Design an enzyme around this catalytic site. Structure first.
Site, mmCIF file in Angstrom:
data_model
loop_
_atom_site.group_PDB
_atom_site.id
_atom_site.type_symbol
_atom_site.label_atom_id
_atom_site.label_comp_id
_atom_site.label_asym_id
_atom_site.label_seq_id
_atom_site.Cartn_x
_atom_site.Cartn_y
_atom_site.Cartn_z
ATOM 1 N N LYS A 63 0.825 -1.195 0.000
ATOM 2 C CA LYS A 63 0.000 0.000 0.000
ATOM 3 C C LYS A 63 0.863 1.250 0.000
ATOM 4 C CE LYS A 63 -4.290 -1.823 1.985
ATOM 5 N NZ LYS A 63 -3.956 -3.261 1.775
ATOM 6 N N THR A 92 -20.903 6.929 12.666
ATOM 7 C CA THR A 92 -20.011 6.565 13.771
ATOM 8 C C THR A 92 -19.297 7.757 14.393
ATOM 9 O OG1 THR A 92 -18.173 6.045 12.234
ATOM 10 C CG2 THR A 92 -19.547 4.196 12.992
ATOM 11 N N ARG A 140 -11.182 21.144 18.364
ATOM 12 C CA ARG A 140 -10.038 20.887 19.244
ATOM 13 C C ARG A 140 -10.091 21.881 20.411
ATOM 14 N NH1 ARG A 140 -7.142 16.632 18.603
ATOM 15 N NH2 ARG A 140 -5.475 17.831 19.630
ATOM 16 N N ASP A 247 -14.206 13.576 30.903
ATOM 17 C CA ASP A 247 -14.191 12.262 31.540
ATOM 18 C C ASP A 247 -13.534 12.419 32.905
ATOM 19 O OD1 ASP A 247 -15.220 10.807 29.260
ATOM 20 O OD2 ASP A 247 -13.234 10.989 28.348
HETATM 21 C C1 LIG Z 1 -5.292 12.121 22.475
HETATM 22 C C2 LIG Z 1 -6.644 11.901 23.165
HETATM 23 C C3 LIG Z 1 -7.508 10.916 22.388
HETATM 24 P P1 LIG Z 1 -7.553 13.538 23.173
HETATM 25 O O1 LIG Z 1 -6.607 14.597 23.581
HETATM 26 O O2 LIG Z 1 -8.024 13.825 21.791
HETATM 27 O O3 LIG Z 1 -8.556 13.362 24.265
HETATM 28 P P2 LIG Z 1 -6.323 11.157 24.863
HETATM 29 O O4 LIG Z 1 -6.657 12.194 25.866
HETATM 30 O O5 LIG Z 1 -4.941 10.619 24.797
HETATM 31 O O6 LIG Z 1 -7.201 9.943 25.061
HETATM 32 P P3 LIG Z 1 -8.625 9.846 25.542
HETATM 33 O O7 LIG Z 1 -9.100 11.170 26.004
HETATM 34 O O8 LIG Z 1 -9.424 9.107 24.529
HETATM 35 O O9 LIG Z 1 -8.570 8.918 26.838
HETATM 36 C C4 LIG Z 1 -7.806 9.316 27.977
HETATM 37 C C5 LIG Z 1 -6.728 8.302 28.271
HETATM 38 O O10 LIG Z 1 -7.336 7.029 28.586
HETATM 39 C C6 LIG Z 1 -6.440 5.985 28.207
HETATM 40 N N1 LIG Z 1 -7.115 5.116 27.250
HETATM 41 C C7 LIG Z 1 -7.952 5.479 26.219
HETATM 42 N N2 LIG Z 1 -8.310 4.469 25.476
HETATM 43 C C8 LIG Z 1 -7.687 3.375 26.063
HETATM 44 C C9 LIG Z 1 -7.681 2.021 25.690
HETATM 45 O O11 LIG Z 1 -8.218 1.494 24.717
HETATM 46 N N3 LIG Z 1 -6.938 1.248 26.577
HETATM 47 C C10 LIG Z 1 -6.279 1.732 27.688
HETATM 48 N N4 LIG Z 1 -5.649 0.836 28.468
HETATM 49 N N5 LIG Z 1 -6.252 2.997 28.020
HETATM 50 C C11 LIG Z 1 -6.974 3.757 27.175
HETATM 51 C C12 LIG Z 1 -5.211 6.654 27.585
HETATM 52 C C13 LIG Z 1 -5.775 7.983 27.126
HETATM 53 O O12 LIG Z 1 -4.740 8.974 27.008
HETATM 54 NA NA NA Z 2 -19.313 7.136 17.661
HETATM 55 NA NA NA Z 3 -11.316 11.365 27.266
#
Ligand SMILES: CC(C)(P(=O)(O)O)P(=O)(O)OP(=O)(O)OC[C@H]1O[C@@H](n2cnc3c(=O)[nH]c(N)nc32)C[C@@H]1O
Ligand code: NA
Ligand code: NA
Ligand SMILES: [Cl-]
Ligand SMILES: [Cl-]
Ligand SMILES: [Cl-]
Ligand SMILES: [Mg+2]
Ligand code: NA
EC number: 2.7.7.7
Length: 326
Positions: A63, A92, A140, A247
């Site tokens: 790819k 989605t 953002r 969250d």
């Molecule tokens: C870059 C981001 C998506 P944003 O700035 O755009 O919000 P983020 O803040 O990095 O992640 P986000 O807010 O979705 O989830 C918070 C944390 O939860 C943990 N976390 C999230 N998903 C998972 C998963 O599938 N598994 C595990 N173990 N931890 C997870 C690690 C994540 O860092």
């Molecule tokens: Na969704």
């Molecule tokens: Na989050």
DNA sequence: GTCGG
DNA sequence: GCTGATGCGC
DNA sequence: CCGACCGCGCATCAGC
């Protein structure tokens, strides 16, 4: 952005496998390749060069060669033309609507933003709010706004009980200049792995944040995890700020380090760290790091007094939060 | 889709 | 009502 | 080959 062209492709392929194909492992295969390549400090010249990195196999290599030559991928060109795949991908994007619900909505003829809006009755609570703030949720959040938000959350929590400790994690803790949402780790002396000496610890915080109009909606709420919406207050005559996803995770005080490790992420970093752990004979979750017995059953929690202790157990040099953005 | 045993 | 499995999300 | 792919909170449903 050094190999942005290629990383975007892979991420599109990942989203396809997840949303349309409902092929979770193919999804992760693509994201990991994208992560590994995004980190590669060289402008990829061929698929052969890419295949050397772990996570990039023979298929992604082909790819990448196609992309480098034509500037695109035929497989994706077709996918973008398939109305069903396009409809499923769009739906989605609404918080609360996953691959299954998306495909079902399509079967019912519910395929666009307008459709969803005139069919609120066919949406559970979460989807309803996801649709409500569909626009805002894709915006953002500048670090500057995260800072104002941090301040409000910490001070309001301090007002409830001076013993609460709220830590902003996610990409913020990783030092990003903008975040997709706000992630708050919360602890209180009353809540330890040994007992819950006080009820409603999380509820009290949510309630106070709603009282000052910071938290505006709730997607889901339980004894330890809150998933909702918030918004910074605007000044007189000033356009109000977009609504933001928030969250809040309540974790046992004595299990802070495993908790802050988890919540700091990234999600792929977590997936990689936990995998490496298994290989090293350990298992890691947001509460503890445990050894793996001969059989495979988890042992008792190992003593932890810093994030680094966790890293040491798996023989990894410590990595500051700013270096965990995979 | 990729990897390790 | 419960438990267990599936969606969805972090 | 071919099995494994991180680990878990909450909302919702099926089966009892
Ligand atoms: C870059 C981001 C998506 P944003 O700035 O755009 O919000 P983020 O803040 O990095 O992640 P986000 O807010 O979705 O989830 C918070 C944390 O939860 C943990 N976390 C999230 N998903 C998972 C998963 O599938 N598994 C595990 N173990 N931890 C997870 C690690 C994540 O860092
Ligand atoms: Na969704
Ligand atoms: Na989050
Ligand atoms: Cl799969
Ligand atoms: Cl800990
Ligand atoms: Cl545990
Ligand atoms: Mg986040
Ligand atoms: Na490779």
């Amino acid at each position: 952005t050094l190999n942005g062209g290629i990383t975007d492709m892979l991420t599109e392929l990942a989203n396809f496998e997840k949303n349309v194909s409902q092929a979770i492992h193919k999804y992760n295969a693509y994201r990991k390749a994208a992560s590994v390549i995004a980190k590669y400090p060289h402008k990829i010249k061929s698929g052969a060069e890419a295949k050397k990195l772990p996570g990039v196999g023979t298929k992604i290599a082909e790819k990448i060669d196609e992309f480098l030559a034509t500037g695109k991928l035929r497989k994706l060109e077709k996918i973008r033309q398939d109305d069903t795949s396009s409809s499923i991908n769009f739906l989605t994007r609404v918080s609360g609507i996953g691959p299954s619900a998306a495909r079902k909505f399509v079967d019912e003829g519910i395929k666009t933003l307008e459709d969803l809006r005139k069919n609120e009755d066919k949406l559970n609570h979460h989807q309803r709010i996801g649709l409500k703030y569909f626009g805002d949720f894709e915006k953002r959040i500048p670090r500057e706004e995260m800072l104002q938000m941090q301040d409000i959350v910490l001070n309001e929590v301090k007002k409830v009980d001076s013993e609460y400790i709220a830590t902003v994690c996610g990409s913020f803790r990783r030092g990003a200049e903008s975040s997709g949402d706000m992630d708050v780790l919360l602890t209180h002396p009353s809540f330890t792995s040994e007992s819950t000496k006080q009820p409603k610890l999380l509820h009290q915080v949510v309630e106070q944040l709603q009282k000052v109009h910071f938290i505006t909606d709730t997607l889901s709420k339980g004894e330890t995890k809150f998933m909702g919406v918030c918004q910074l207050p605007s000044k007189n005559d000033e356009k109000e700020y977009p609504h933001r996803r928030i969250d809040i995770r309540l974790i046992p005080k004595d299990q802070y380090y495993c908790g802050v490790l988890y919540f700091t992420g990234s999600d792929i970093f977590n997936k990689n760290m936990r995998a490496h752990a298994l290989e090293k004979g350990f298992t890691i979750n947001e509460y503890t790091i445990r050894p793996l017995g001969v059989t495979g059953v988890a042992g008792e929690p190992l003593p932890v007094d810093s994030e680094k202790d966790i890293f040491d157990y798996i023989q990894w040099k410590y990595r500051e939060p700013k270096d965990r953005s995979e």
